[PDB]
């Protein structure tokens, strides 16, 4: 399983890479815009913040397939092994086919439906990113979409993986993991919630208090 | 998975072959009739419109097994590697057996029931095409028929594949894919719906607006 | 159960009112636009085409709540007992509340989610119209949305009914009916498919042939 | 069904009361603290922002049952018919029993488990508020807890209602509604998401474009 | 729903009756033996510890039906309205029939199977007490037994109620409540766990901290 | 619920009538034959052994409807209010109709299928007796047959009851009770197993030992 | 999968062997009796009617194991590779074991229960034939029996196959195929129904009418 | 699958070994006691009655682990390759471990719970024998216990097999087989029921009558 | 499957290692504190009590990752091959990553949620220990958490095993085993309950009584 953070916050990535078993960092245009640093600045900084080991993802902006390929080349000049995110639209699918022919790995993003996601994998995408919370917020079922998508990839495009994205609560992430998703990307707030629990803190405090009671200290 | 378009519209096939990851094009007598061009004109055009890479399918018209075999030979003289569609009737099954003996690949079409479909595969058909929407429109369950048929082929005639056909909505196609169908053929309207979504367009617009807000342009 | 036709085709309404047990006719802005006749011409014609017995529905066009209320008054001046369709948007909900206070019956339309639909009923709508095929075509589950919506109304706003709408195949309509929808509106092609079956025609022909064989005629 | 907003934002309540069919407003200590206005200021402002029709809820702060009863009296002196929220702790349960004897309506809050919630209803609470997202975020299932709690109330304390609370996504609210909850309280962001959908906006725009095409305007 | 404590600890009952919404107290021979006080001392103390409002249950010791009836009379001379617990054995069933004829309310106890429990209700018992944890500890399913028993009573002896007993964890009690049991009796440790949660304490502390931050105190 | 014993053992009936809440005794030709006493001897003895209050059932032996009616009269001359068991065969159904016209209550016996059983109830039988273990032993599912039969009676012949019969293990009886059967008849061995359990005996012994430990006696 | 016809109608077999993909023909004593030709006449005629390529099955008549073995030798002298059908009775099982030792392939027939069928496979039968319709007609579930039998063979005697038999409707055959049966034998009427459908004929007629409309003929 | 008879009846074993495909014979202390012959007489007779090919099982009587090991050695001196049955108690588990170290194969018997059974396999037992009917008779579910036990062995101790035992009806044996049990032992009455069916006899009789009708005899 | 005891009771471990098939012993800070012996005394004693064959586990006490690594080194200096338990907190995850790099095997403990548990396995833990009863006691579902966690490990971190812990009743342990947990640790009371059953003792007593009846002794 590959676990990513969905962020352009370099300081946070450096701090959290020590804690989480990260495969890398994913970005998108809104995340990059929120951080205010251009791609040629922030991508290398994110790469460094993971000690040069993590995989990076970043998204094209052009609206024609040819423009998207040119964007991909720009991204790859910044980070040689970056995975290029392409929105799964008509022109995006055309771009994914072209990038497959060029040997540049892609992720099919802005996926709101399972068939849409599958098309991107059939076209060559290595990863497919459904926007779980967007589907949930807009009256659908993000989890059903993810469940369906994973099944479709495993039956029909088995080289491709779901990279589940767009989360407001740990439960959504848990449900994607239970559906079999082979990768996931978490925003910082959800990631931090997933490792901090009042019940866990209470269990550890009880261990400390019992140890103190018997041995007069809380250290080993 | 093999994805086909169900059409005789040469201009559309050329345009869509750039977008979709197509395995080829399927035709039937109504589709050919609607396009108004004879088989010896349209089939070579369709073959060219896919850059010579796609598989083609076309259907016999005769009502006796012997006549269907003669139709198959005519079709194969137009396109050497064409897959011949035979309606799964008593004479059709007899024809499928004869074509198997001749080494000509066949598809069993006009399938309205799972056992009917299985018989065509046991007789030698490489593909079996249930008419999903026809079953749905006539008070049955196209999806249950497809689900059943796919299970029957995988248990009892595992060399054969379901090629699901006859669709009025993307949901029918999705449900066939979730049932495991190893091939599918889409009419142009359903195919175009499967890659165009208001929610996806809105996600892409939001990315563009956020990028504009931060960087003063919408390009990378 | 209330069965409606979703059309502005006066000739077809006449012909089908004799066959179907219709409660009335629903229109929307696309349906009215397609027919090319203004509301003050077509609505009285549709009312006549059902022999003055059917209920009519038509939709507001304004984008502010106050404008929608004014549109409702215009519609009611054309057909005194017409049910006014209001899209379930923020201003639409505000309009539904105002129309409830005025005693004008409403339908909440353009429903793509169950919670959205429920809000329109809580605001006062007597009917809620999910767009089943639109949800299906855009990667969701129209049938799950209808199932959920009907359950929500029956638990939380039991005076309101689902009026299921937007269909490409009889199976969608059947599934809405099996989910419990107390009303439905069919486009003409789907309505005609629901009463014409090759197997039924074959059963009737067999009855006629057997009768002929025994009695020398096909009449009673 | 009773629909509440979970907020102390008086301007927003006034604006949203025109759109949503609100039963009232719920507050808690964090919400009140975030708004920075004391109870004796903000509660009367909220009451007015709903035109004097909505029900209000506010929470005690004391940690002994006797202190909580005194807090309840203070709250009722600000808003005569306010429902008093009491955290479901040992002293909270004792307070709920005392308030039942005094005839002051209560809500059992900070519910993280179904049995805990049931105990508050058996003690006399009219409403029980599970913290759905808190349970979800801390590795449980908020929806299973709500489902279980509602069943427990309907079997064992049928005068009491679930008032589902603590939401980060509309899907959580939908699932609570489907589980049968007779009341719910939404934060502003989730409430606004529940009434704004790209697919709905696109449907309305298509209606406008079709109308414009036929009639040369977008008004009725 | 009737909630009981399964104890002979008078001091604890007095303390917990202020917190829990108790219907009364159940005792059995082991519970009485553990407390070391005879029945004619402890039963009146328990009755007072609940302020004279709670129902009491206590168990016969004799092994013949006639002896059990005599024990019932002794118990009723200590507490006039006490419910008499009879083990569901052959002689116990005979005793339950006799006590029904005498108008003395009974509970069928030491139930390890659903049919056994039903027989006690058919014989006249008002309550039937499966030993949930005993069934669980001995390789069965206490919850399945309770689920089955409650269904049997509601179908076949609807005047009788399950009084679920014998618990080591709150989850067992929750599952009995979800199965529909109309009464339950909790040992003190499980009852205390059901009202004390680290996550709830943390929620209350966060409320206090937020209030402090804004207003400079933790009181209302 | 009506509980019967399936026996001709008069001594056992008398002993068990004190323990079980019996509605009566059922006999059949094999049971009567096994006991070796003629009907005119054993039926009165069984009636007395229940203190003149139990319902009795006995079976006809004739193979024609007319003969079965005559047998019914012979049975009624021995026990005036006896319920007459008739095997559900073609002649048996004819007899059941005749007996309905005469006002003599009947039970449809030797039922091996649900539809067969339903026919007997539609003909007038007050009770229908599937042979559960016979169906089980002969490769069917006695429990499915009972489940189906009970549903059929409640939907289609609601005045009739299932009287489940033919048991080798308590589990079969439990499963019939859980399926909703309103009456049941148990052979003596199964009945005795249903009230004697090693685990229950161990619970009672533990209560006695704990009481002895604390109070120096095992009596109350 | 192996598909058989269940018939002694030599003319029909010859005609149908051209249409169906047949593995052979099964006979039984009633089928042979109905055809009125002795085994030494009809078996060679059936073998010829399939062009010498189909497998044959025929049934022993003796009631002792030794007699059944002698019958098997007689059958094998008529058709050297015939599969010998043995009814699964006590003596039949003994015969199956003896025939296994002799290397003569057997089928266990007249199977009305799954355990009975499994015993025949454990004894050495290569095929097991449940009588589906007989089980259905006699108040059981033929499909459950087949489903269970197939599972038992695949777990416990995996060299053996279910040869499902005894059908009145195509739906029974479909359900056996869906249960996984690796062979089936169809009576002629059911086989003919499985390849003849009014809806399929209507689809083919529509293709012809559309082709005629466009090209002025119905031939290719 | 290994099929055993649960008996000490030497004459019956000889007769049935010709009919059933037996793997051997199991005995227990009650079975041996019922036959009245000592182990050193009956075990060699049973071994002979199966022609020297069947596996035998017999049970230790000692209550300490050391005594059980001595009993195992005595049993193995009578039948060199006998499988030794050890009750799964604390001392039994200790004995199973010792016998594993000595290389003497064991069966863990008197299993009334799945975890208990699993422990015996983890300790070294090759077979684990749940007492299905005992669990059923005592208010549990023998089939759930067997289902659970088989799952536990296959996951956690895959070298061990369930040997299901203790049966009063063929249905119990069928359900154990459907649960996957790799071995089973049947008492003689259940075994005989499993091969004798009135419906099967009637099928064979009909075949005979039809053959007679056509050919004037009932032989081949 | 690996079975552990959760204890620091050296005498009990020695006694139980003769009965149970133990893989080793787990300790935690409360267990060690309860035993009152320091780690450098008790761990070698536990190791000896299992004859030097069992695996041991013990827990770090430090709150920073660097401190936890130092604690791990101290533990490994006491017992060279000990598995080091680390609480799954932010610093614990950081420690698990460091220990993975150092090649020191770890267990992720104090797990109250499935995602939390998975993170510890992704970070390098060989075992993950959910606190089953703690989750149950605090209003969750310990069994659902274990079920989910095991599925997550098998899909996403297949080198890791669930070591289920924290039990009050054998049923909890059974349900963990049925969920697939590859290891488990039992407190002494639960372990002892799992091998002691009144029904089993009664079965063994019946065997002894039958043997006595036939042979005049209870020994072999
Ligand atoms: Cl994936
Ligand atoms: Cl397929
Ligand atoms: Cl409705
Ligand atoms: Cl509620
Ligand atoms: Cl109850
Ligand atoms: Cl009934
Ligand atoms: Cl098979
Ligand atoms: Cl097994
Ligand atoms: Cl595991």
From Swiss-Prot, chains A, B, C, D, E, F, G, H, I:
Stored InterPro entries: Aldolase_TIM, F6P_aldolase, TAL/FSA, Transaldolase_3B/F6P_aldolase, Transaldolase_AS, TSA/FSA_arc/bac
Catalytic activity of the protein: beta-D-fructose 6-phosphate = dihydroxyacetone + D-glyceraldehyde 3-phosphate
Gene Ontology CC annotation, any one: cytoplasm
Activity modulation comment: Inhibited by glycerol, inorganic phosphate and arabinose 5-phosphate.
EC assignment: 4.1.2.-
Subcellular location: Cytoplasm
Entry's pH dependence statement: Optimum pH is about 8.5. Active from pH 6 to 12.
Temperature section of the record: Displays a broad temperature optimum and is active in the range from 20 to 75 degrees Celsius. Although no significant loss of activity is detected after 600 hours of incubation at 45 degrees Celsius (at pH 8.0), the respective half-lives of the enzyme are 200 hours at 55 degrees Celsius, 30 hours at 65 degrees Celsius, and 16 hours at 75 degrees Celsius.
This protein's record includes keyword Cytoplasm: yes
Keyword Lyase among record annotations: yes
Example GO molecular function: fructose 6-phosphate aldolase activity
Active site: 85
Main localization category: cytoplasm
Biological-process GO terms, alphabetical: fructose metabolic process; ketone catabolic process
Keywords of the record: Carbohydrate metabolism, Cytoplasm, Lyase, Schiff base
Applied biotechnology uses: Is an interesting tool in chemoenzymatic synthesis for the construction of chiral complex polyhydroxylated sugar-type structures. The use of hydroxyacetone (acetol) as a donor compound allows access to various 1-deoxysugars. Can also be used for the synthesis of a broad range of iminocyclitols, that are potent glycosidase and glycosyltransferase inhibitors, from dihydroxyacetone, hydroxyacetone or 1-hydroxy-butan-2-one as donor substrate, and a range of acceptor substrates.
NCBIfam families on file: fsa_talC_mipB, PRK12653.1
Leftover remarks: Is not inhibited by EDTA which points to a metal-independent mode of action.
Family per similarity comment: Belongs to the transaldolase family. Type 3A subfamily.
Assembly behavior: Homodecamer. Five subunits are arranged as a pentamer, and two ring-like pentamers pack like a donut to form the decamer.
Biological function: Catalyzes the reversible formation of fructose 6-phosphate from dihydroxyacetone (DHA) and D-glyceraldehyde 3-phosphate via an aldolization reaction. Can utilize several aldehydes as acceptor compounds in vitro, and hydroxyacetone (HA) or 1-hydroxy-butan-2-one as alternative donor substrate. Is also able to catalyze the direct stereoselective self-aldol addition of glycolaldehyde to furnish D-(-)-threose, and cross-aldol reactions of glycolaldehyde to other aldehyde acceptors.
Listed name of the protein: Fructose-6-phosphate aldolase 1
């Amino acid at each position: 399983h590959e676990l990513y953070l969905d962020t352009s916050d370099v300081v946070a990535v450096k701090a959290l890479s020590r804690i989480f078993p990260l495969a890398g960092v994913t970005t998108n245009p809104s995340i990059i815009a929120a951080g205010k640093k251009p791609l040629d600045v922030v991508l290398p900084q994110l790469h460094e913040a993971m000690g040069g080991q993590g995989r990076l993802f970043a998204e094209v902006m052009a609206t024609t397939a040819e423009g998207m390929v040119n964007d991909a080349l720009k991204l790859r000049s910044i980070i040689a092994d970056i995975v290029v995110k392409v929105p799964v639209t008509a022109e995006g699918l055309a771009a994914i086919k072209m990038l497959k022919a060029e040997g540049i790995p892609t992720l099919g993003t802005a996926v709101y439906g399972a068939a849409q996601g599958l098309l991107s994998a059939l076209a060559g995408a290595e990863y497919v990113a459904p926007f779980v919370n967007r589907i949930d917020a807009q009256g659908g079922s993000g989890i059903q979409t993810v469940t369906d998508l994973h099944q479709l990839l495993k039956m029909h495009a088995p080289q491709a993986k779901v990279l589940a994205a767009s989360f407001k609560t740990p439960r959504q992430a848990l449900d994607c993991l239970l559906a079999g998703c082979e990768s996931i990307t978490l925003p910082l707030d959800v990631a931090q919630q997933m490792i901090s629990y009042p019940a866990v803190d209470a269990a550890v405090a009880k261990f400390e208090q019992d140890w103190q009671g018997a041995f007069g200290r809380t250290s080993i």
